[PDB]
Structure 1
Amino acid sequence: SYDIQAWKKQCEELLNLIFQCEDSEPFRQPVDLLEYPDYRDIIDTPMDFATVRETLEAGNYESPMELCKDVRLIFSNSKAYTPSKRSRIYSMSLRLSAFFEEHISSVLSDYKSALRFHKR
């Protein structure tokens, strides 16, 4: 299955699944400064799933690796903001990260395989 473009609809599908997960609620929109006015003191580069979906739909990812880097930044920002590993929102981030990694694995493998076939 050597389709170089297939990753994009596969990532749209996976983002739909992540938006159906109750565990994504805190990560569906950029963090609000009013409620967390010190957020930018802690977090250099904010990221959320609506920004990832918009970047994809605009045609501003070249590869599923770039999308994966932004999704992993949502989870690292959560781990860096949490006061404890026993926090509600950090706990939601760890379950969502395990779901994301389970599903993105084949998307990355199939893409890299398609690019190797193209250069064969």
Structure 2
Amino acid sequence: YDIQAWKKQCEELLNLIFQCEDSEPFRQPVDLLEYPDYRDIIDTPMDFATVRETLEAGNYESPMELCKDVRLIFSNSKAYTPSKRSRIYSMSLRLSAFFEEHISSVLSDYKSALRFHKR
């Protein structure tokens, strides 16, 4: 029932994401020089370095907030892709499946810890 445990769990999950090849297009903000129309389609850019930095600065209050930002990386990829068969979008789907598979217990444990605290 550790209310703070999600933070290190998210740091470890981000380490796994950064280790894998599929995260390369999502590690840093999208290069606007290589994709000049990006901000015409995407309102809120997001990347894994920004998520990790927000976490490390103590600027997430819960794993749900981190999860909303990570999901924004994947929804931005889906919205910017010219095709559902594109290389970068296909990497985003694999990374999203891995992220969802691992964030589920982090969210459940956190919500369980808060319920126990409220008793």
The interval holding the TM-score normalised by the smaller chain is: over 0.9
Runs of 4+ in 1 over 6 A off after TM superposition: none
Task: Indicate the RMSD between aligned Cα atoms, in angstroms.
Answer: 0.3
1:52-110 Cα deviation digits (max 9, x unpaired) = 00000000000000000000000000000001111000000000000000000000000
Give the distance between the partners of 1:33 and 1:3, measured in 2 at CA.
Answer: 41
Return the offset for 1:11: 0.1
- Distance in 2, Cα, partners of 1:33 & 1:96: 22
Instruction: Tell me the SS of whatever aligns to 1:86.
Output: coil
C-alpha separation in 2, matches of 1:89 and 1:47:
15
Quick one: percent identity of the two aligned structures?
100
> Residue by residue, what CA displacement relative to the aligned partner does 1:18-68 show, whole Å, maximum 9, x if unpaired?
001100000000001111111000000000000000000000000000000
Query: Gaps (5+ residues) in structure 1?
Result: none
CA distance in 2, matches of 1:32, 1:76: 17
What TM-score do the two structures reach when normalised by structure 1? 0.99
Q: 1: distance between equivalents of 2:72 and 2:21?
A: 19
